[model samples]
Every structure is written in C-alpha cells, then in structure tokens.
Target: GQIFTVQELKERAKVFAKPIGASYQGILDQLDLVHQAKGRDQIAASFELNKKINDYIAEHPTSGRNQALTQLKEQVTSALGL
Candidate 1:
C-alpha cells in the first residue's frame, strides 16, 4: 500500500470509481460534508466515508491485484484531468 497526503487522497477518492464506470459522486460529496463538520464529527464522518469507499472497492473485482492497482491509478490520473 502507499500513503498519500489528505489532499491527494481526497482527489483520488473523488475519482476512484470513475474507471470502473461506477458512480462515486455521492461518496465524494460526503467529503465536503465531512469537511464542514467539527472535531470528532469530521473524524467519524471521514472514516465512515473511507469504509464506504473501501467496501465498494472490495465488492468490485478487477483483473488482478497488480493490474487493478495500475488501472485504478491510471483511471484516477485521467479522472483528475491530468
């Protein structure tokens, strides 16, 4: 696994389900909600959203772990308009 800054990860999360032709706007929108939250609300909401995203990834399978990682990264890059 790799670590990313909050901003970077948030950007990635914004497009995480794009490549798979899945809708992630709802999940990403929650980030905005979390951002507006205060203290523990922020932490809790963020973790909940994280789990939701992780759960989506877990439920959706790709070719293989390595290929999936590569594809996901590429997708995210494109999704970010980079």
Candidate 2:
C-alpha cells in the first residue's frame, strides 16, 4: 500500500479555500438575508483557479505537488483581482 499523508493536502486546502470558502460563506449568508448578489464573480474566478490546479494535478502528477502548488498559489495571487 502507498502510505497516505494528507497533512499537506489538508494544509493546502486551508490556504486556497480561504477566499473561495469565505466568499461562498458571505454569498450564502447575504443571499438568505437579502435574497441575492455578491461575490458571485469571485467564487467563479476562484473555482477556475481551483479547477486549473486539479487539471495540473491530474496531468502533471509529479510536478503537481512539487511546484504546481507553489506556482498555482502565485497564479491565485495574481488573479486575486477576483
């Protein structure tokens, strides 16, 4: 069996899930209270980055964990115009 170590994966999730998670949280809270609008764009943008990360992980299995994480983090930061 390939010993599993989700320690890194867990930490990584905590990192990016910030804006993605919080944006959704804020969106939901406001929607229920006011019935719509806010952070929709941000959520979609973040999701794009999120999927971009996964595509790399699925394609570049080796570099995914090694440099993709770091590089993707940079991309997220740059795309933070969201």
Candidate 3:
C-alpha cells in the first residue's frame, strides 16, 4: 500500500482503517511519511496551526464554520501545491 500523495491517502482512508484505539506510534509513522514527502518543520507548524484554527472554529461554530473549513482546505492545498 504505497500512497504517492495526500490525495491518494485520502482516497484510501487508511487512517480510518484503525479508527478504534489508534496508537500515537502509528500516527507518528504516518506523520513521518508525510514529513519526508513534504517538510518536517513546515508540516508540523502548519498542522499545529490548522488544529488551532479548527479548535477555534469548533468553539465558534455559529460564527464562520463554512468559511473556516474552506480556508482550511485552501491553506493545505496551497501549502502542498495540490
């Protein structure tokens, strides 16, 4: 199971395969792959910032949920050039 890109990973939904009690090690492996394909510091910072933005949106769902989701996708796509 070789995922060439993030799009491929999403299409396969490999992360959801072990939804129940997934371990941090497994997640770190995936993140490592992504970091190798992409960049470590950049991906880490973006991921953390995206999580922060998501948390903010989740807390203020009534304010701008749609816009926040759209911006999130745009940010990722722009970063990955997808």
Query: lDDT per prediction?
Result: 0.65, 0.51, 0.49
Candidate 3: minimum summed lDDT over ten consecutive residues — where? 15-24
In the range 9-78, model 3's lDDT, one tens digit per residue, is: 4433443433321443444555555556656766775676556556545554432334344445666777
The lDDT of model 2 is 0.51
Clashing pairs in 2: none
User: Would you list the rank order by TM-score, best first?
Assistant: 1, 2, 3
**Most accurate candidate by lDDT:** 1
Model 2 lowest lDDT segment of ten: 29-38
Question: Residue 76 lDDT in model 1?
Answer: 66
Cα displacement (Å) at residue 35, model 3: 16
Comparing candidate 1 with candidate 2, which one achieves the higher lDDT?
1
Off by over 4 Å in 2: 1-4, 35-82
lDDT of 3: 0.49
* Residue pairs in collision within model 3: none
Measured by TM-score, the strongest candidate is 1
Q: Which ten residues in a row have the lowest lDDT in candidate 1?
A: 62-71
Per residue, candidate 1 scores C-alpha lDDT tens digits across 1-82 of: 3444456555565465455544356577777889899999999999988986887577656523444456557766776777
